Amino acid sequence: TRFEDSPSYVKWGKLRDYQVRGLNWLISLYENGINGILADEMGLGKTLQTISLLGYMKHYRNIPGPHMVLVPKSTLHNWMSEFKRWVPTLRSVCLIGDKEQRAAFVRDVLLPGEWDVCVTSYEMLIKEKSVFKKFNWRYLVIDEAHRIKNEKSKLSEIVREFKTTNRLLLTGTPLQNNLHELWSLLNFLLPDVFNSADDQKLVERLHMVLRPFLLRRIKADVEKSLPPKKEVKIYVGLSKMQREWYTRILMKKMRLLNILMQLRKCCNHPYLFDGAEPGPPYTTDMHLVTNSGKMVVLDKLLPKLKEQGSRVLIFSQMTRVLDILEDYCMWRNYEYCRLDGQTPHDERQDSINAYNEPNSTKFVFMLSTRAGGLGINLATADVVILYDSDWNPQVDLQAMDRAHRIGQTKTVRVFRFITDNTVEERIVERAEMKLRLDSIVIQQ
Amino acid sequence: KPHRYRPGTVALREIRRYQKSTELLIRKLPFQRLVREIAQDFKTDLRFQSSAVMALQEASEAYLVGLFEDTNLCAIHAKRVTIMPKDIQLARRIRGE
Amino acid sequence: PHRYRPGTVALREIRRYQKSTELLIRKLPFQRLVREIAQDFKTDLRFQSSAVMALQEASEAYLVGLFEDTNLCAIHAKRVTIMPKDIQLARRIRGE
Amino acid sequence: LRDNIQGITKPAIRRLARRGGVKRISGLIYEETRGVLKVFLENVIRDAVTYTEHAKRKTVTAMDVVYALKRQGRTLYGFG
Amino acid sequence: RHRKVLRDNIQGITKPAIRRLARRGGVKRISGLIYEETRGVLKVFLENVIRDAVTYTEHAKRKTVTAMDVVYALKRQGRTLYGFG
Amino acid sequence: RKTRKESYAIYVYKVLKQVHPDTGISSKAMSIMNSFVNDVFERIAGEASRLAHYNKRSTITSREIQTAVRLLLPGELAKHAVSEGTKAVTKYTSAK
Amino acid sequence: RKTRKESYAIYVYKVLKQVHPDTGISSKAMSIMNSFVNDVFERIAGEASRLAHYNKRSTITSREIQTAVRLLLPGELAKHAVSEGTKAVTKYTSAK
Amino acid sequence: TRAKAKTRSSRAGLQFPVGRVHRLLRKGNYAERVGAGAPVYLAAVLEYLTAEILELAGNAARDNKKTRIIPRHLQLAVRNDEELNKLLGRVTIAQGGVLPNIQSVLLPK
Amino acid sequence: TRAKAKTRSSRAGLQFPVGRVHRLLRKGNYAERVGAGAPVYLAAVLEYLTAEILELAGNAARDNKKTRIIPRHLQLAVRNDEELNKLLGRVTIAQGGVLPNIQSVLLPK
DNA sequence: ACAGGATGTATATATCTGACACGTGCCTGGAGACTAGGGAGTAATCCCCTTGGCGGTTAAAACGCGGGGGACAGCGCGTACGTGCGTTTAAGCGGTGCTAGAGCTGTCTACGACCAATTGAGCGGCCTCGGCACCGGGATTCTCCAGGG
DNA sequence: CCTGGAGAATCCCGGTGCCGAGGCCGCTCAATTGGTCGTAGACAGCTCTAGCACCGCTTAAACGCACGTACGCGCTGTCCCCCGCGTTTTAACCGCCAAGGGGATTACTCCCTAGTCTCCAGGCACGTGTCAGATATATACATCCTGTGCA
Ligand SMILES: Nc1ncnc2c1ncn2[C@@H]1O[C@H](COP(=O)(O)OP(=O)(O)OP(=O)(O)O)[C@@H](O)[C@H]1O
């Protein structure tokens, strides 16, 4: 019904068959006049398809007026650079900076309306909802649709109150822990259709109702490249002092308002808590490892991963642990790069992009469960180390497959540390259940 | 050369501004942390309804404002403008605390 | 001619009256004052002796406390004499 | 009954001041003390007379005085 | 090794905050040694109120201090508060 | 379903409508007025109960409420409130 | 004859003979002690009534008395009074 | 049958819940028996006090160029009026602020 | 038949009347019901407070070389014990006097 | 001493939004009608206690005067605080994830109200004596001039 | 400027008298003992609401620092006011008497309020929309401070 090979107006774009068929599918969805969800987890890209969609909408029957793209602030410069490189015919503007900078921007750009695509962040959108509500919208592009997964959130209300003729949601993790998230997404797409919250009342009916306006293609089933990862769990024990502290915490001066939280990271490292927290900073010497069996095991496992490859990209669950280990691996006897929420974003982007290096000989690099977004592949990363698992399995999946870009042509390895007769196994089994639910919903 | 208000104009401006308003002046999170630390001594494992901390903050603000009024009165009695801990102690002693 | 310094007799009187426990206001004038004040609120009122005694006791205690606060105010003001403005400051801070 | 506030004399006020703990007294203190005594007594007597009126009597009792003082927050021990 | 405590909670209330309170009171010039005394006085007042409120909560067999408990404690102390129950 | 709570909000709004016709009120103002009415009711009821206990009676009556009003309210307010209460009792008793 | 009057005088005398076997008391001091006992009774009972009303209960119990004592008495007085009351209630339960 | 029910508040010419006040008096453990006219008298006194306070608050709100009454207007009305100030001396009105008052010694001259 | 009546105070080993306290609680309009242990608890508290104040007053009386407690001795004990002073902060004791203290500034050179 | 320049504030106008004012539907408590009982009003009588008067006495107040010390106005100074400016940080708001704890329903039991008989505990009255108030007299200590230190 | 007397003021010891404290009786009324019953609260169960621990981003607020200026404080002189003491009135204090008012008790009656049942309507929870208030932004105005002849 539409083009079968690369569109003539793309500049140097090399979108393949899956990309062109997704473009045709989105064009047909626009034709029939319904919104949709582009559920491409990875290996396919959504930025290219979205930019190609908007470029087609401009270079065909004219609709060059207002258009809104919602991105996290951490990827705005990347989005603008990719847009300029790929399709430079359209004009793009960005809403950033403080109050006076955004006032300068609205005055010198927004009122004249010489722009086709407007790229901003969630926070700026909340700040300037009133300024943005004076303009009609024809194709609202939002990435990471799980950002509006729940109702009663301010962003959900703001985006609902917006006036958009059509909508487009980009998400790689369509389901997290329950069907009310997919219901929220579908209700935002079609409020007049999915008004009510309502094996046959399940699974299969869900598949049938999601088929018409959803796309889900596996990177392995499309390209057959990107050799699959190997996932290994390591059943780690815990020290006797760790057990004693775990007991004295569990059965009961220190504050333990949230009992599950305060009887949790205990297995990660004992001295994370107060009371027995590191005392006088004697020096950076051998005191931290000897008190925790998990880091003892990590130290024992280091040499084999060090003998070759050795870019790890270790993952931990506690920021406390991430930052201490970030400033710790340098002292241990290695070189590192640091990623955290305390690092500024504008510097962060170029910093990580430049830190992507053919030869570093540094052996360590640490990213938090949240601090890592979606981008920047280290082809040298081989062995994934999961110190502790988060409740959300999709966050763990994102942390695992952030190294599963094409930039990575080697089989990648995953290491998992698990304690025994503790709540870490509880978190693991809950994550397994949620991951299985997501798999059955989005694959069967 | 740059414009410089004399020492005592901005104080009067702030006095009028703050006597004109009604909102709270202490920071909510520090006040809540102080309240929880005090409650720890009396009993551990305590939860605070969000309205209780607001009521405590309101009462603390009223008490401090009234005390400062009386302390200013004591300082004016001593033929001074600066208020002092001796003035505060005298005011508390007279009020019966 | 023997004459004490101006201020030692005051200290002796202070000590003696702080040691003593009896009333200091003349009973008959206080009784007449009470009856005169009560004449405003009611006509031809009779009183028990214990009622007048309790009124006198309460008045004495209130005035002693007021004078103590006034002395504190005067000492704060770098003085040893008490003044009507000291009494007014004491009343204002006490709550009148 | 007229001008009985003059019955409360300067020596009595000086004795009260000495018991309070003051050394020097200004000459204008006496009128102020008479005024404060007047207002205090007026309040207490008003409340006691109200109690007597409710009791439907014509005599004011020590119990009525104690009740008035307890209303004002000046509890008296030793009269009932 | 990087592990230490930041600041104790009594210093949570700040010198500019105490200055704002004194401005609302009516104070024009403030001595430098007023802030520690203000912190002590506030600590004592809060201790009394919180003791009474925790006693009420303990009697109710609850573990959540409520606005009603705070109001009852303030009324017992003699500082009736209007606007919470 | 939540258990209903009794508030004087409707009656206070009727009084406000009678006093200032075109004038509203805020939620916190309504709460403050409700608390004020509760406090005044508690004060007067406690005073009346203590009065009845002192006089060795078992009934709180209009005389007790009047005496409590005169003891609590300050002067002119007490006078006008007494007039209003007497008028209300007269209306409730005249032909009812 | 004269209608009977009630006082805690005999019990105060018993406690005095207990703590100090060779010390006497006067009528004024006995009246003061009687007033003190009445005042403490009134305060504790009123606080307990307020507590029972607040918790929506219609019975005064040992728990309410203990809580009122904790509210009213300061510090060491509260601690020792609670210990004494608990011991007395334990003995009464045992000997019933 | 039975006649049409007239509320005792409507009978007494009041605007306050005479029946609710009667129930509160009987349920407050104030005494054993309660008279018939006592709740009516108490409701009338409450009505007068509320009306005076609302009148002063409305005057203040009209002065401040506003229609809705806020706790600031309530506190402003309660203060600046000696009778109500004496009645409500020990109470604190939330978010009512403080009266504008600067001692003349501080004012430059 | 029955047995010899045992007083509740004797059963609890108290010198204060549990029965009289119970009657006063019933006739006090405090609550509709009164538990069995509440009068015992109240009597123990009253006895302890009386014992403390009487011990302090008797020590003061012996210190003054008299064998009869008077309101002066009671006042001295109450004002010298800080817990009892806080309990009786706003209480006046007839024929009590005041504590002897002279401000250090008024003492001569 | 004014003129003028630089801040701050009061004011008018246009948008926007969320809290208030009103509606609707239902349900729990207030009103109507009646019956019993005991609390309180009402009358009468007793006695005590408050008031008015009067006389004698002596302590306390009123009055005058000399003199010292404390209040008060003035001057000088050094310094701690107020003002402004630049840099850092953590509060505030928006989300995530979890579960504990409050609040309402329902059943059962054991505990306190109520009543009747009995009795000893406590209260009013009465009497005696010894602890305390008062007085006197001697011993002790504190204060204030005079001057030689 | 530290000693030394002289003079009041105070305390300690002993003797005397008086009135209130402490012990002892009668009786009557409130507390004790026994038995019954019904309702308030204890205990168990369940739902869902809210509270606690933690992340990212923004930005107002806090923190630190330099300069200078009113302000607190120490000191000095003046003078007038308060105190100490002696003297004269004045009225409080105490003892005694007489009379009448009014507080307190007792008996009798009735009328007002508790308790019940029945029903219905006023009051509350819940939705929903629109207008009063909050805010931004651009004028006009008031105020403060400092420089320039003459004060
Ligand atoms: N121009 C292209 N031509 C062909 N394949 C491409 C192109 N760009 C991206 N891809 C495919 O997409 C993979 C990753 O693309 P990219 O990093 O742009 O993803 P993304 O936009 O971050 O993903 P998501 O869809 O989850 O937002 C590559 O490894 C490759 O297989």
Numbering used by the authors:
A (entry chain W): 166 to 363, 377 to 430, 443 to 634
B (entry chain A): 37 to 133
C (entry chain E): 38 to 133
D (entry chain F): 22 to 101
E (entry chain B): 17 to 101
F (entry chain H), G (entry chain D): 27 to 122
H (entry chain G), I (entry chain C): 10 to 118
Study authors write:
All known remodeler enzymes use an Snf2-type ATPase motor to slide nucleosomal DNA around the histone octamer, but the precise underlying mechanism is unclear. Here, we use cryo-electron microscopy (cryo-EM) to visualize the continuous motion of nucleosomal DNA induced by human chromatin remodeler SNF2H, an ISWI family member. We merged the datasets from all conditions and performed extensive data analyses to determine 13 unique structures of the active SNF2H bound to the nucleosome. Based on the conformations of DNA at SHL2 and of SNF2H, we clustered our 13 structures into five groups (A to E).
In group A (ATP hydrolysis, 15% of A-D particles), DNA and SNF2H adopt a conformation overall similar to that in the structures of nucleosome-remodeler complexes with ADP-BeFx. The DNA at SHL2 is pulled out by 1–2 Å relative to the canonical nucleosome structure and the density for nucleotide bound to SNF2H is in a position similar to that of ADP-BeFx11, which is consistent with either ATP or ADP-Pi occupancy. However, we observe a gradual rotation of SNF2H lobe 2 towards SHL3, relative to the ADP-BeFx-bound structure, starting in the A1 structure and becoming more pronounced in the A2 and A3 structures. These features indicate that group A structures represent conformational states downstream of the ADP-BeFx-bound state. Compared to A3, the SNF2H lobe 2 in the B1 structure continues to rotate toward SHL3, whereas the brace helix and lobe 1 remain stable.
